Motif scaffolding. Structure first.
Motif, PDB file in Angstrom:
ATOM      1  N   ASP A  35       1.472  -1.556  -0.255  1.00 58.35           N
ATOM      2  CA  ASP A  35       0.309   0.083   0.119  1.00 58.35           C
ATOM      3  C   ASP A  35       1.062   1.289   0.284  1.00 58.35           C
ATOM      4  O   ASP A  35       1.016   2.395  -0.661  1.00 58.35           O
ATOM      5  N   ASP A  37       3.739   1.205  -1.147  1.00 63.04           N
ATOM      6  CA  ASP A  37       3.961   1.426  -2.565  1.00 63.04           C
ATOM      7  C   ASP A  37       3.195   1.854  -3.930  1.00 63.04           C
ATOM      8  O   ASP A  37       3.179   2.771  -4.909  1.00 63.04           O
ATOM      9  N   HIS A  38       2.037   1.604  -3.563  1.00 58.56           N
ATOM     10  CA  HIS A  38       0.902   2.413  -4.414  1.00 58.56           C
ATOM     11  C   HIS A  38       0.923   3.657  -4.051  1.00 58.56           C
ATOM     12  O   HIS A  38       0.855   4.667  -4.431  1.00 58.56           O
ATOM     13  N   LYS A  40       3.330   5.493  -3.182  1.00 58.21           N
ATOM     14  CA  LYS A  40       4.452   6.846  -4.020  1.00 58.21           C
ATOM     15  C   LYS A  40       4.117   6.727  -5.492  1.00 58.21           C
ATOM     16  O   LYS A  40       4.765   7.535  -5.353  1.00 58.21           O
ATOM     17  N   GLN A  41       4.523   5.700  -5.404  1.00 56.03           N
ATOM     18  CA  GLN A  41       3.658   5.318  -7.752  1.00 56.03           C
ATOM     19  C   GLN A  41       2.590   5.970  -8.170  1.00 56.03           C
ATOM     20  O   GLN A  41       2.147   6.977  -8.770  1.00 56.03           O
ATOM     21  N   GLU A  42       1.731   6.421  -7.583  1.00 54.69           N
ATOM     22  CA  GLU A  42       0.455   6.704  -7.440  1.00 54.69           C
ATOM     23  C   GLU A  42      -0.575   8.007  -7.512  1.00 54.69           C
ATOM     24  O   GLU A  42      -0.938   8.712  -8.197  1.00 54.69           O
ATOM     25  N   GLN A  43       0.413   8.690  -5.736  1.00 57.92           N
ATOM     26  CA  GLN A  43      -0.180   9.461  -5.830  1.00 57.92           C
ATOM     27  C   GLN A  43       1.074  10.214  -4.856  1.00 57.92           C
ATOM     28  O   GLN A  43       1.255  11.885  -4.067  1.00 57.92           O
ATOM     29  N   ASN A  44       2.280   9.839  -4.951  1.00 54.68           N
ATOM     30  CA  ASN A  44       4.005  11.337  -4.943  1.00 54.68           C
ATOM     31  C   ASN A  44       3.597  10.918  -3.835  1.00 54.68           C
ATOM     32  O   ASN A  44       4.100  12.532  -3.345  1.00 54.68           O
ATOM     33  N   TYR A 114       0.710  11.981   3.339  1.00 51.99           N
ATOM     34  CA  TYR A 114      -0.355  10.848   3.581  1.00 51.99           C
ATOM     35  C   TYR A 114      -0.893  11.414   5.375  1.00 51.99           C
ATOM     36  O   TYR A 114       0.113  10.463   5.895  1.00 51.99           O
TER      37      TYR A 114
END
Length: 206
Positions: A35, A37-38, A40-44, A114
């Motif tokens: 989660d 990784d998600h 970092k990758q999708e929401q910077n 976040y």
């Protein structure tokens, strides 16, 4: 897949979140390292602000150490400012510190922050609304409605108003917050806003 209740946490549905401002995402707890990784990758995401108590992480059976390890691997800073669930007095007491961490992370500018608690329904929206009120040139009702319009939830407004009183206070023998009507500290004058911002920043790393 079935109907669920709207203002309550459904942990079995996995991590959920809402982007509130470009710099600020409010959500539920990451449940596993993937989660992160998600995020970092999708929401910077570059910062995570975790508002849970140890008791909450235990109840939920989350491996926080593996979560934090993955954050470090990816260059994300993980921050803890615990507060008690469904407890406006706790939230009020912890709001200045929690907002100090949030606002520091935003000021660094490396990516989105976040902000989460167990469900992202009380504590995390509460911290986010206090941040908007104190740092983003709005009054409390605007700050409040702005978040709740995007993410339906039930943050305690009184907790945020009481933390505002706490930070604007210059007399330790002022009448208590609990004696004031609902409208006290729902807006703040420019000098009070400046005072609050300095006091919040002064808690950075306390």
């Amino acid at each position: 897949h079935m109907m669920r209740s709207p203002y309550e946490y459904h942990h079995d549905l996995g991590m959920n979140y809402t982007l509130i401002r470009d710099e600020l995402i409010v959500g539920s707890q990451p449940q596993k390292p993937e989660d992160i990784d998600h995020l970092k990758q999708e929401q910077n995401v570059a910062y995570i602000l975790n508002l849970q108590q140890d008791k909450d992480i235990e109840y939920w059976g989350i491996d926080l150490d593996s979560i934090v390890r993955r954050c470090k691997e990816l260059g994300i800073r993980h921050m803890r400012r615990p507060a008690k669930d469904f407890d406006p007095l706790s939230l009020r007491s912890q709001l200045p510190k929690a907002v100090s961490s949030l606002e520091w992370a935003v000021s660094e500018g490396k990516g989105r922050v976040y902000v989460h608690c167990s469900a992202g329904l009380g504590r995390a929206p509460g911290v986010s609304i206090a941040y908007m009120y104190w740092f983003c040139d709005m009054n409390l009702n605007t700050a409040y409605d702005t978040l709740v319009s995007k993410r339906p939830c039930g943050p305690n407004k009184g907790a945020i108003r009481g933390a505002t009183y706490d930070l604007a206070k210059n007399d330790p023998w002022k009448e208590p917050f609990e004696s004031l009507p609902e409208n006290a500290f729902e807006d703040i004058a420019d000098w009070e806003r400046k005072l609050i911002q300095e006091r919040v920043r002064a808690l950075r790393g306390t």
